[PDB]
Design a protein around this ligand. Structure first.
Ligand SMILES: [K+]
Lengths: 85, 84, 88
């Protein structure tokens, strides 16, 4: 990997979220290394670890996921894995 | 238009989620839902996939089977029709 | 209740994390309505939905959770549930 990141998705409705977010990840040419989804209280929640063999622009990715999350009524965060290693 | 269940079984999950979800996307299929478990000496995953276009299950079964061999896992794809 | 939030945690190692984070939530006088944890690739992750019957200050909580997170080498995010409910 040149890039790795953890993506967090929080919303109220689960409907179509896994398809939307996985499709977006794929649109951006990122690999899904792992994924998990959990209903928690009244919320549907989803986390994915993603990567690419090329350096990416987190400024762009963060804004792009944020804007995409908004279209689906969910909050999306992306964190570079560089924080841990 | 198309809906299916993909089941994956192998001994080691290293790289399996990326490989299989990557193959799914290469084939233009949507991942509607996904789950994984470690089971005995095995890792398993399942995904429900779909497309707005008709698909050829004959081709897909063969393609996922061949792809599975490259990763040392067994991949089945079954149409949603069969779980009727 | 008057406050509800979703807390998310990411780090490399699970050792001590559940105890540290649940312990911090109780110190802050917050209720855990629900919780879940998973290993995800090489990371330990947990998520919790918390609430209080008193209004809270998310400016303070965000800072406090991030600061506490650092003591445990984990990234802690908190999001008010109001964002998913409120009209505009
Ligand atoms: K939102």
């Amino acid at each position: 990997n040149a890039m790795k990141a953890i993506i967090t998705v929080v919303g109220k409705d689960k409907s179509g979220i896994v398809a939307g977010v996985s499709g977006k990840i794929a649109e951006l040419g990122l690999n899904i290394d792992d994924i998990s989804q959990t209903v928690l209280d009244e919320y549907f929640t989803m986390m994915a670890v993603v990567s690419s063999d090329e350096k990416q622009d987190f400024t762009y990715l963060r804004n792009e996921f944020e804007a995409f999350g908004q279209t689906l009524n969910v909050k999306i965060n992306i964190q570079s894995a560089a924080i841990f290693e």
